[PDB]
Amino acid sequence: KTVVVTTILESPYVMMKKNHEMLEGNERYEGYCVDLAAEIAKHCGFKYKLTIVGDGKYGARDADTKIWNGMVGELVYGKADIAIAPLTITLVREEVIDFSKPFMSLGISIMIKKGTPIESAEDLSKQTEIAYGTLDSGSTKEFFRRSKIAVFDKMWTYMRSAEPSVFVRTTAEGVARVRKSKGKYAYLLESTMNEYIEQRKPCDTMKVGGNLDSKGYGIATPKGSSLGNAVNLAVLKLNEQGLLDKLKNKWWYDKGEC
Numbered sequence: 001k002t003v004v005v006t007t008i009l010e011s012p013y014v015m016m017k018k019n020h021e022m023l024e025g026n027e028r029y030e031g032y033c034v035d036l037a038a039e040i041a042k043h044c045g046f047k048y049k050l051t052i053v054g055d056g057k058y059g060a061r062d063a064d065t066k067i068w069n070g071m072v073g074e075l076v077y078g079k080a081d082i083a084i085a086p087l088t089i090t091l092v093r094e095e096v097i098d099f100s101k102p103f104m105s106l107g108i109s110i111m112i113k114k115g116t117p118i119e120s121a122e123d124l125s126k127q128t129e130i131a132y133g134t135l136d137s138g139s140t141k142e143f144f145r146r147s148k149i150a151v152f153d154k155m156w157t158y159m160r161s162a163e164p165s166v167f168v169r170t171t172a173e174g175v176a177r178v179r180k181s182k183g184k185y186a187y188l189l190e191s192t193m194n195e196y197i198e199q200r201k202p203c204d205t206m207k208v209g210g211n212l213d214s215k216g217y218g219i220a221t222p223k224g225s226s227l228g229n230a231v232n233l234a235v236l237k238l239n240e241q242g243l244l245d246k247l248k249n250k251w252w253y254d255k256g257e258c
């Protein structure tokens with residue numbers, strides 16, 4: 001059967017082509033993960049249909065409801081066959097679905113407006129005049145919650161209680177708030193999105209310091225899937241031959257504006 005790929009709109013992973021209105025099917029999307037899906041399909045020998053995740057979410061389990069949302073939920077409930085998106089490999093997700101080896105390696109990072117006296121996470125926690133927060137939900141937020149490393153455990157302590165919520169709802173909202181915040185707000189996000197935005201006009205932001213942790217993005221399939229082993233060997237083949245790094249330069253640095 002034809003494989004149903006769940007993915008999500010987020011630059012430069014997946015975006016609607018300009019002429020999307022006059023296009024159909026897989027031809028109406030473009031991006032790192034669209035390019036990646038085509039490669040994975042060619043290597044594993046399958047025809048597929050790219051679909052944008054119903055709820056625009058990635059994957060989390062509602063507390064008492066115990067229902068999984070997002071792309072992971074589409075995999076878990078059988079609404080999708082494979083998830084090709086910037087979906088962070090985490091324990092809670094790997095408990096319910098399968099992840100391939102990373103196709104991309106990243107880590108949480110700090111994004112500041114050009115000119116901020118913050119050069120590190122320590123610099124951040126040790127003060128308070130400079131605001132700093134994460135996405136309202138996602139893997140970065142859970143990193144600070146499930147945390148007990150001196151600075152990170154202390155950083156979380158500070159965030160939850162912050163006055164204006166310091167938490168944002170989207171990536172574009174954290175960037176918009178760092179730029180409209182005129183120096184006061186620092187956004188904590190994944191290095192990948194950070195590297196991408198550091199290459200967009202007005203070229204007024206920048207990644208600072210090293211990453212807080214070492215993670216990866218993986219292609220997910222429902223636990224015990226026939227496709228699992230194939231996609232996993234596909235990712236390793238793509239990495240080894242260097243195509244993964246070419247695809248990143250393409251979507252991140254070839255068209256760099258700064």
Ligand SMILES: C=C(C)[C@H]1CN[C@H](C(=O)O)[C@H]1CC(=O)O
Pocket residue numbers: 010058086087088135137138139140141171188189190
């Ligand atoms: C863009 C979003 C909401 C995603 C992308 N990977 C992370 C994930 O899969 O949880 C989330 C970002 C973050 O939490 O910093």
